[PDB]
Design an enzyme around this catalytic site. Sequence first.
Site, PDB file in Angstrom:
ATOM      1  N   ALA A 215      32.730  19.169   8.121  1.00  0.00           N
ATOM      2  CA  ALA A 215      31.914  18.025   7.725  1.00  0.00           C
ATOM      3  C   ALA A 215      32.778  16.967   7.044  1.00  0.00           C
ATOM      4  O   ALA A 215      32.440  16.462   5.975  1.00  0.00           O
ATOM      5  CB  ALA A 215      30.782  18.459   6.804  1.00  0.00           C
TER       6      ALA A 215
ATOM      7  N   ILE B  12      30.864  11.931   2.554  1.00  0.00           N
ATOM      8  CA  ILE B  12      29.892  12.023   3.637  1.00  0.00           C
ATOM      9  C   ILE B  12      30.330  12.998   4.724  1.00  0.00           C
ATOM     10  O   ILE B  12      31.478  12.969   5.167  1.00  0.00           O
ATOM     11  CB  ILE B  12      29.646  10.647   4.286  1.00  0.00           C
ATOM     12  CG1 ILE B  12      29.508   9.563   3.215  1.00  0.00           C
ATOM     13  CG2 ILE B  12      28.414  10.686   5.179  1.00  0.00           C
ATOM     14  CD1 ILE B  12      29.343   8.170   3.784  1.00  0.00           C
ATOM     15  N   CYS B  13      29.412  13.860   5.149  1.00  0.00           N
ATOM     16  CA  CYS B  13      29.666  14.753   6.271  1.00  0.00           C
ATOM     17  C   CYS B  13      29.005  14.201   7.527  1.00  0.00           C
ATOM     18  O   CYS B  13      27.788  14.283   7.685  1.00  0.00           O
ATOM     19  CB  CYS B  13      29.156  16.166   5.976  1.00  0.00           C
ATOM     20  SG  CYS B  13      29.482  17.369   7.291  1.00  0.00           S
ATOM     21  N   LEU B  14      29.814  13.629   8.412  1.00  0.00           N
ATOM     22  CA  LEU B  14      29.305  13.012   9.630  1.00  0.00           C
ATOM     23  C   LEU B  14      30.363  13.052  10.730  1.00  0.00           C
ATOM     24  O   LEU B  14      31.508  12.659  10.511  1.00  0.00           O
ATOM     25  CB  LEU B  14      28.869  11.574   9.349  1.00  0.00           C
ATOM     26  CG  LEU B  14      28.063  10.851  10.428  1.00  0.00           C
ATOM     27  CD1 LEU B  14      26.860  11.680  10.851  1.00  0.00           C
ATOM     28  CD2 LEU B  14      27.624   9.489   9.920  1.00  0.00           C
TER      29      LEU B  14
ATOM     30  N   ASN C   9      23.802  16.026   3.148  1.00  0.00           N
ATOM     31  CA  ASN C   9      25.055  15.727   3.834  1.00  0.00           C
ATOM     32  C   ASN C   9      25.966  14.813   3.020  1.00  0.00           C
ATOM     33  O   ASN C   9      27.029  14.405   3.488  1.00  0.00           O
ATOM     34  CB  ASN C   9      24.773  15.097   5.200  1.00  0.00           C
ATOM     35  CG  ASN C   9      24.008  16.027   6.123  1.00  0.00           C
ATOM     36  OD1 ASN C   9      22.897  15.717   6.556  1.00  0.00           O
ATOM     37  ND2 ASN C   9      24.601  17.174   6.430  1.00  0.00           N
TER      38      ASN C   9
END
Lengths: 151, 76
Positions: free
Chosen positions: B76, A88-90, A81
């Site tokens: 994302a 960052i993928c969050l 991620n």
Amino acid sequence: GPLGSALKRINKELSDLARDPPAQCSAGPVGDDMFHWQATIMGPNDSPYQGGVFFLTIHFPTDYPFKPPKVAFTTRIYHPNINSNGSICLDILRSQWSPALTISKVLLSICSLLCDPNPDDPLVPEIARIYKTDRDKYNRISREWTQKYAM
Amino acid sequence: MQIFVKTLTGKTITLEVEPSDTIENVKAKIQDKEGIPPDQQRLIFAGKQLEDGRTLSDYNIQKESTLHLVLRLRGA
């Protein structure tokens, strides 16, 4: 102004971090600019990143807290991620951001991300593939990158 | 027919295909060798993003052709 509104919100969160310090996490202004923070995250014990220290940059937009803060890793890390640029993928940093949430909650959410990645919607497909199908290889390589860049 | 697929990491993939094979079929073959699902795949050739629903012959992709595999991000 909009800049003025964000400034006092940032200071409030900074004082709250002083009174109730996060565990294995710290953050604060780089210099004298309150909108630009630097943060550290210790490698969580229940993760292959244990023993490493990871630095992050935190930039507050002028419309904070109505817009989410911009967070990125500066330390390289092996994660599905998180890409090579530190992006960052969050969800909490985008579609699921809420003004009620804090930097402390963001850092805690990142800590959990290191313990339990989200491989189905990854930022690095190859790493996600290894995480899902060969967990031993994932843990093995994660520890190696920790030794090389987080020590 | 034999074509090639180059990744961002530098790895060159060798696939066995046919001119009548759709782009979706090709993405399925990539999944067989790399394990990466089609929805996370994005194919580039001749300066164009290859669309699911068309064949290799539609884009006039012939033997020894090299495709570029890039990322396909979904929130994302």
